[PDB]
Amino acid sequence: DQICIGYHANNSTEQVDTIMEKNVTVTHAQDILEKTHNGKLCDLNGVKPLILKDCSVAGWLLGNPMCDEFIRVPEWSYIVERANPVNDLCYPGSLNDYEELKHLLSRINHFEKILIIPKSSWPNHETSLGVSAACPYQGAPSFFRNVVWLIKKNDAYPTIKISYNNTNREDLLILWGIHHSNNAEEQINLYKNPTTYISVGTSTLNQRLVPKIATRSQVNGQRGRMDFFWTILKPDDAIHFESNGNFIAPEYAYKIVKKGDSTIMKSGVEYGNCNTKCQTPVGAINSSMPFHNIHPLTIGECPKYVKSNKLVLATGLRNSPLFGAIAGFIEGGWQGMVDGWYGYHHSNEQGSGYAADKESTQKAIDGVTNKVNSIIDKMNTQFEAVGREFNNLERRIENLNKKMEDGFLDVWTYNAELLVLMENERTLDFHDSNVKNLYDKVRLQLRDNAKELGNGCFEFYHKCDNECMESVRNGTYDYPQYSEEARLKRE
Amino acid sequence: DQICIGYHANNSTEQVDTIMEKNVTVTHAQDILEKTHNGKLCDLNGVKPLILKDCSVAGWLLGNPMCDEFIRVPEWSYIVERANPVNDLCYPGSLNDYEELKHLLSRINHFEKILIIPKSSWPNHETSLGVSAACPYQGAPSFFRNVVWLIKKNDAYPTIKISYNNTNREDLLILWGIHHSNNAEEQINLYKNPTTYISVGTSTLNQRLVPKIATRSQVNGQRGRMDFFWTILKPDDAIHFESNGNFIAPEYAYKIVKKGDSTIMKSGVEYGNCNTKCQTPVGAINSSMPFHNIHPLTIGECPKYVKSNKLVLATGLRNSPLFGAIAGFIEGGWQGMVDGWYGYHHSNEQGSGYAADKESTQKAIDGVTNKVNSIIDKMNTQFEAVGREFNNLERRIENLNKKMEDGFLDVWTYNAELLVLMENERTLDFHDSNVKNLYDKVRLQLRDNAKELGNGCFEFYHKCDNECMESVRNGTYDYPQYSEEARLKRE
Amino acid sequence: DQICIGYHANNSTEQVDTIMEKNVTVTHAQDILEKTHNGKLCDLNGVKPLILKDCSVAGWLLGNPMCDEFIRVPEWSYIVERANPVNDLCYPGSLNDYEELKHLLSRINHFEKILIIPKSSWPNHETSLGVSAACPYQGAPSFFRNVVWLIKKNDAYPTIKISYNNTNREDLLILWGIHHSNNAEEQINLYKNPTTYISVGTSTLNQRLVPKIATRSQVNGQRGRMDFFWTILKPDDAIHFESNGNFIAPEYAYKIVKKGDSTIMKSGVEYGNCNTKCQTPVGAINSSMPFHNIHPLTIGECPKYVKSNKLVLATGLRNSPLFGAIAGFIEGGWQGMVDGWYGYHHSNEQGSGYAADKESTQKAIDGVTNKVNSIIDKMNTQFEAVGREFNNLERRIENLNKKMEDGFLDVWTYNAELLVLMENERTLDFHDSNVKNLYDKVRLQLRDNAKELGNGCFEFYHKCDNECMESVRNGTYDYPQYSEEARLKRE
């Protein structure tokens, strides 16, 4: 007659890592790293992204004629721009503080284009001749839609003085520009006056622009340049303009009607007619895992990004093909013990069977669950990357930005890989201890009434029927009741 | 007759968390987190802060007339500005590189304001008419004290050419300005000259300023603006000015006498004629704990900031409501034992009583004490936030700043919280180990001169006088000497 | 007759630290921190650095006459500049965007200077009068070599118009300048024309410069100033210049022919005629070690920098001067067991000896080296500091940079020291555990055929010849056979 302490084995090939041993097969594991995406740009909680196709943000806001698709756009969840849009500033030049502007757009979900200065407001200047073959529309010269390129009328450009007062209740993005002509003759020919300026005044803005009449390379057919500027006009402030030439006046402006979470993804992946809680530049994520390795730049309800390829938490025991029990003095585990991690096998008159020890098994489930939860929960406050953009002469700052973001990525990747690695080791040892402690609880009850065989089995010196077995499995084994019989059975 | 091995218990309610278990009641515990402050701004090693009340630094340094409390100030330890001061640039305008000037102030403890250009040096310009309702002093029109607003005299403004040589041994901080007039009639009424400039030369500076005469919004009731500039004049260099108009000239400048470690604190909490070695914006800290959670931006000899609400190290044992002793084969601890952590319980005919094993108990104290100390020391070189400032067109750099400073708080919080969780688990297991080893040291002496009861108790098979039972704790025991009595009682 | 279990001891004095105990002698250890460097600057994998002596980068690129030895420079591995070189900008002024230019050089290994505008190209200007006492060469007034200070000829400065087209297949760095004269008179003596400008145009550049004629301090004997500008001219683009005075025109320009990892290194250390795979500003490093503590800023294949004095890993066991065995119930280790880490000593009528358990020892070695490797491999992706540069008005950003690099440094120093502490403690307890498990393996085989002395040793109850002793060590000990003799000997 005998009773045995043993543990679970099953047909698992799930594998796990520790500091001392790699690729350890365990009975149960939990993967915590999301490795797949759907290869598509999607809606984000049923709000579709503004996809700019081949337009730059600047092309959109100034109203490049190739960007008409975007003349009026519903509220967006995120903005999508290609790496090198082709439609962007058809007439060459620049948008000042372009990247600071894009930084504003990343907290904006909706604009409403309003007309603030109609062509009616310009009766002594020419509002229709301000076009270029650099900005074709329908096989003819055209221009940016949101601004007007004012030209002289009757061989005269009298001085413009116009104010505009923001009587909307929201912030207003206004854009305007200056034209740098190529030479003294071109300047007379467009504007009459040789020497010219633009004055722009706000409560906070005080700007004076003067044309640089100079010789440059042809870009998109033009040696001329147009430099654009912008400002937020707060509710109840006014903007004042003065110019006696080279002025590219605002026609429309953008009222900021909804702020919130957004971003400007750089991506050329297609829209997928689908919805998601979480979007990256390479595809969207449908997952409950705490971590992923898809891309550092995400928006939505997101797993936390790390640079790993595998990240599995051991929950159960080392599987069969520090405390000395598991794969030690108990040689392997039991396929036949299906209903618990640790338990008993008994052999007697009435036969045999496996039975989980439920108390000690619940303890271990409790603890392993709280470990997983503690590990998930501690990694809620990791770093999250944010796209920021830098122009050509901010390379120091761009490099600093990149190192800082990679810096935290490496720290958080290390922290995650190592915590898993260390806690896996502890989890295997925990199991090994739980089993040694179970074997010891039995050893202590029996004492001299049975022989330790040294492989985790107790051979009884008396007869142990089924209710005597259940007595050992629940810690109520009456030692005196069998001691005499046990006495006799020695020698 | 029995000896027992057991462990301390008490009435303590102090709790600690581990990876597998939250809210574990333990006997002893050391909080390491500071959660209170005195609610007041104080002196810092006897040196008082400069409290600008409702003045900005710009207001102080240019000498807004509503800031006359600060016309001459003693040495300071730190500076305290409200979040939004009402008394800034009274006459609307700007102070160029204002954020950089303030960064400089963060390493200055004292200025000596000095006269460098006396009003008597302007024979040929009016020095008395340079006042404005936008700078009221008691309802009357005034102007910034530290600079002077020259106007025409006798419908004339001749060209100014003056120098100042810095013959102090200290660096000097000099401010000057330019006035932007509203239109050409105004320009002629203040200065005579319609077209004007200001030149400024040092060994490094080479500035030309030209007025932007334009229409602007009114602020503080003025449509005009004043743009102020600053340089640091080295201790044998000279500054050279030239102007035929619009010049706001230096009268006073600031000698940089004491450099040191300061900061500019944003706070509205009140002064309290007190003294500390560590100050935050919400109040002062009187602590020797190694961590606090009051505010990120301290100055002084301070603990290290974390985002935790709780941070308690376990020192002692699991309290009674891995190595299988504490709350294993030994039910519970002993309220009765006082002078120790691990010990013994008599039970012979002379009586009973509790004895501590002072060797074991000591090796534990040494270990736990050195753990706490090793932990505190490893956190000496965490991250200390600085309070950098940024303007309205430096939002990307401000976002970078915010993000990395937060990132480091989240890194150090994760580190602090996890180290405590891990070492807490290791601490309780250390106690458990110590108990087990003590029990084994005593089991291997008795051999079969006692019954292993299996609850930590040893029923002898002979008779132990106090003389004898003290021979167990020492380690000194003769097995043969008491063997005789055994086998007779055994059978 | 007896057999004892024990472990290795030796004459090693190597120490290591754990959380609970500092300076523990162990039998083997592993330094992982390189602490020593050769105090010299060296070739990097065969390639000599460019050492500027007391020339600045500005000096070199503009061609200061004191910097003549850098007219034609071979491919370099890194650049070395002193902290304040004395030959920089002999004629006072500035180089615009100097820090951004250095940033660019940090990715360049080789330029090829080429003549792009020969002196024959200025038939109607003076090409030989543009010299100054501030740029002496061999006792004569002179000038920068890579540009030309054009002055009037025959009391005339005809307006200059000139283009240069980058017909090379390589990017071209071009430098030019404007001279700020001190007054109207001087302006006339040099250039006939009182009011002058410079226009520079590329596809992307649009510059207008006007001289600031003003009073300034003398520097190197001169009150005038020269402001230099630079651009990268892409293949197949052209640069266009127009001036009528104060132009410092290009003569030579630099083709960028080799790009890769470089760095501009601030150092005064003498070159040492020698080679290295890793270089720092204070000396070169030849190391196998994974970590070092020499300098943050390093170039080459290097260790990872940490701010620590000691970093030693435990591999062997506690040395003789948690699991209960090592320095527990087995008091000390054994100088005489030399073949391995854990083993047996036996003592029988045929004598005595030591034998190492190869199976225990080998498992132990595997685990410990896998741990050492695991730790080293987790420390691959630490943060690498980078030299970046900032002017006198970028102090916030400088300071954000300092605190960010110092922040990552302190994080990784913490991660390394604490990983070492934590796994040392584990390594020691692992040994402790391997010994215990080996004791208990023997105990189980002998059962009651022997007496546990409680000190690591089994006093047999029968006669254990040499073949019997090899039993116990093999794990083949035959309990049946000796059973009776053993029984008889208990009496």
Side-chain angles (χ1 to χ4, degrees), chain A residues 22 217 322 395-396 399, chain C residues 100 237 374 388-389 394 433:
Chain A
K22 273 59 70 172
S217 304
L322 210 75
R395 287 210 161 117
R396 287 171 300 141
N399 180 77
Chain C
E100 283 292 309
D237 197 21
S374 270
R388 308 196 179 66
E389 287 201 56
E394 297 179 314
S433 153

Side-chain angles (χ1 to χ4, degrees), chain A residues 2-23:
Chain A
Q2 57 186 84
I3 203 173
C4 295
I5 303 321
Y7 55 94
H8 191 81
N10 67 17
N11 68 351
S12 173
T13 41
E14 277 226 79
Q15 268 195 151
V16 115
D17 274 19
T18 68
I19 311 89
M20 288 191 154
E21 194 179 0
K22 273 59 70 172
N23 284 8

Side-chain angles (χ1 to χ4, degrees), chain A residues 164 166 170-174 202 231-235 237-239:
Chain A
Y164 174 81
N166 177 15
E170 292 278 32
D171 286 347
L172 206 62
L173 179 70
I174 302 157
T202 267
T231 206
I232 309 295
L233 185 56
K234 305 211 219 76
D237 194 12
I239 180 159

Side-chain angles (χ1 to χ4, degrees), chain B residues 97 99-100 103-104 107 161 163 199-208 230 237-240 242 323 363 366-368 370-372 374-375 378-379 381-384 386 388-391 394 397 400-401 404-405 408 411-412 415-416 419 422-423 426 429-430 433 436-437 440 443-444 447 479 487, chain C residues 18-22 92-93 180 210-219 223 225 227 307 322-325 327 329 391-415 417-418 421-422 425-426 429 436 439 443 451-455 459 461 491:
Chain B
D97 293 334
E99 291 76 27
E100 284 287 313
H103 181 78
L104 221 71
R107 290 103 171 236
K161 310 176 176 200
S163 296
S199 283
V200 189
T202 77
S203 58
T204 55
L205 197 69
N206 186 28
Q207 170 189 71
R208 199 184 181 250
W230 64 267
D237 192 19
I239 186 147
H240 307 262
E242 182 170 312
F323 292 91
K363 191 194 197 70
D366 290 358
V368 166
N370 295 359
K371 158 178 306 193
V372 177
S374 290
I375 288 160
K378 278 318 91 206
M379 306 286 184
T381 77
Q382 308 199 151
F383 177 80
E384 181 214 77
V386 186
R388 280 170 301 248
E389 308 196 49
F390 295 106
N391 70 54
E394 298 173 308
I397 282 41
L400 205 159
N401 196 71
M404 80 129 193
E405 289 223 312
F408 277 124
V411 166
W412 283 105
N415 285 332
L419 189 50
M422 280 188 304
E423 293 308 306
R426 295 194 63 73
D429 292 326
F430 180 54
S433 167
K436 192 205 176 50
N437 298 314
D440 280 349
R443 200 200 59 245
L444 291 171
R447 306 184 239 201
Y479 167 68
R487 168 265 294 112
Chain C
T18 71
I19 292 85
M20 276 191 260
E21 204 186 351
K22 308 295 162 166
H180 305 285
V210 176
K212 281 176 261 157
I213 300 171
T215 304
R216 295 177 284 279
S217 285
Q218 281 177 45
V219 181
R223 300 198 174 262
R225 293 287 186 268
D227 282 345
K307 283 172 52 59
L322 205 73
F323 284 85
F329 81 85
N391 60 67
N392 208 302
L393 284 178
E394 297 179 314
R395 293 267 160 91
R396 295 169 291 140
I397 312 75
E398 200 163 24
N399 175 257
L400 195 176
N401 194 74
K402 178 157 205 185
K403 293 322 181 167
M404 190 219 59
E405 293 195 317
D406 265 309
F408 279 114
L409 176 59
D410 292 329
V411 166
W412 284 107
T413 289
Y414 167 92
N415 282 332
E417 291 183 355
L418 175 83
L421 250 30
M422 279 173 52
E425 194 146 76
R426 291 198 77 71
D429 294 321
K436 196 202 174 51
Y439 177 88
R443 188 178 60 107
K451 189 188 195 197
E452 287 176 66
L453 297 200
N455 61 0
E459 189 165 66
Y461 283 129
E491 288 165 359

Side-chain angles (χ1 to χ4, degrees), chain B residues 150-179:
Chain B
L150 312 175
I151 304 308
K152 70 191 196 185
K153 181 204 263 294
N154 308 312
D155 214 70
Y157 198 120
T159 308
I160 291 161
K161 310 176 176 200
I162 165 176
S163 296
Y164 173 86
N165 181 312
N166 181 3
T167 68
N168 308 269
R169 274 226 311 168
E170 295 81 285
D171 287 350
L172 242 69
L173 167 72
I174 305 189
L175 296 106
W176 60 99
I178 181 167
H179 175 230

